[PDB]
């Protein structure tokens, strides 16, 4: 009737990665993108399952940001709005500081927030960033899905347009696709010796050739 802000677990007859097989007992559909895929049984322990879910979420978000920052500047260079973009050679460019001191500064700045996130995972609610306004009531967020004023300034979560489970599976699926994409780009940059969009262009033309088997 209103907006439900709780994740709804998928029914036990949900579509699976391998239809006709029995989904594992530790995957009951309560997690985003739950398709019953665990051949090695790595998620048997619920605590390790929570840690692996958070790790998958983090890898998903970093991979989506990574693939966006590879593809969009590469699509701009092919269009012509970037003079000398190359994501493989981007790390060896000349900046205002050495890579080592930039790495140390990045380590400190990122280990602040990664460690605040660690404290939130260990103790939910120990660190709160959303303001405690005098009569506004802050809803309790899920671990790994925070966000009031800063991380969720759109209020697109918490049951708004698509239910929280639907948007979370969408995020997880795009993240898995981006992880596979980034690993593919990393292998293509050292195998083909070319860019991503160039490789796509030579694969779309005569796809019977210009493949993994022709370098």
């Amino acid at each position: 009737g209103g907006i439900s802000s709780v994740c709804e677990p998928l029914p036990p007859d949900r579509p699976l990665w391998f239809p006709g097989s029995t989904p594992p007992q530790w995957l009951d559909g309560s997690l985003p993108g739950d398709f019953g895929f665990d051949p090695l049984g790595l998620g048997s322990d619920p605590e390790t399952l929570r840690w692996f879910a958070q790790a998958e979420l983090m890898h998903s978000r970093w991979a989506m940001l990574a693939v966006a920052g590879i593809l969009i500047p590469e699509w701009l260079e092919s269009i012509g709005l970037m003079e000398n973009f190359n994501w493989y050679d981007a790390g060896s460019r000349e900046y205002f500081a050495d890579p080592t001191t930039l790495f140390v500064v990045q380590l400190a700045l990122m280990g602040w927030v990664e460690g605040r996130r660690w404290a939130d995972y260990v103790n939910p609610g120990c660190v709160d960033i959303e303001p405690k306004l005098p009569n506004r009531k802050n809803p309790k967020p899920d671990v790994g899905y925070p966000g009031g004023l800063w991380f969720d300034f759109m209020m697109w979560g918490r049951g708004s347009p698509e239910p929280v489970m639907v948007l979370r599976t969408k995020e997880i699926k795009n993240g898995r696709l981006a992880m596979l994409a980034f690993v593919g780009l990393c292998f293509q940059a050292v195998y083909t010796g070319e860019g991503p969009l160039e490789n796509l262009s030579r694969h779309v033309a005569d796809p019977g050739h210009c493949n993994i088997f022709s370098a």
Binding site: F96, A97, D98, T100, T101, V104, R116, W118, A119, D120, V122, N123, C126, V127
Partner: protein, 198 residues
């Protein structure tokens, strides 16, 4: 006013918050024993106060020398300077006086309120007081020793000990004054950091 050094972590049981400057920072469980905590409070107070005096002595004269008001040698080069007495006599005098005053302090640490009285002029005695904060003659301006002042003193002491560690490490790696290191950092920070001195 207690606070946490780590928001996620819980405070230890022996660090309830009675002591000033309590942020629950004992990850290595050094002060689990109450006698150990009682000794470590005094050790922290004395080390922090000496670090205050030391960091002031190695920072402010160097800043004034760089400005040009006075011509004072660096803190590492002040040992070889010329004085009215040699360094050995000064060390012996300092050893004698420090032996006396620190033995008196150690007696107060072992049993509080036992060495408050003058041994020469017995009519002079310190008022009753907590260990580590001896009032009377040591507090001529009669400033109130509230817990806010104790917390501020402990915070400045911890900052001073960190600053002294930075002082000795920076002189060990660069061989120049800490304010000279600050000026070199302020010249262009992104190529004058810890990284480029190695």
């Amino acid at each position: 006013k207690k606070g946490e050094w780590l928001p996620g972590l819980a405070s230890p049981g022996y660090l309830t918050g009675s002591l000033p400057g309590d942020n629950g920072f004992d990850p290595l469980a050094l002060a689990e024993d109450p006698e150990n905590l009682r000794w470590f409070v005094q050790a922290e107070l004395v080390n922090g106060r000496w670090a205050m005096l030391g960091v002031a002595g190695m920072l402010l004269p160097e800043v004034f020398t760089s400005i040009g008001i006075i011509d004072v040698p660096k803190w590492y080069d002040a040992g070889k300077s010329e004085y009215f007495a040699s360094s050995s006599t000064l060390f012996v005098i300092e050893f004698i006086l420090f032996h006396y005053v620190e033995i008196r302090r150690w007696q107060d640490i072992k049993n509080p309120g036992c060495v408050n009285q003058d041994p020469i002029f017995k009519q002079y005695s310190l008022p009753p007081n907590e260990c580590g904060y001896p009032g009377g003659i040591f507090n001529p301006l009669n400033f109130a020793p509230t817990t806010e002042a104790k917390e501020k003193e402990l915070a400045n002491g911890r900052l001073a000990m960190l600053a002294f560690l930075g002082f000795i490490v920076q002189h060990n790696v660069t061989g120049k004054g800490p304010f000279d290191n600050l000026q070199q950092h302020l010249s262009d920070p992104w190529h004058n950091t810890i990284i480029q001195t190695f």
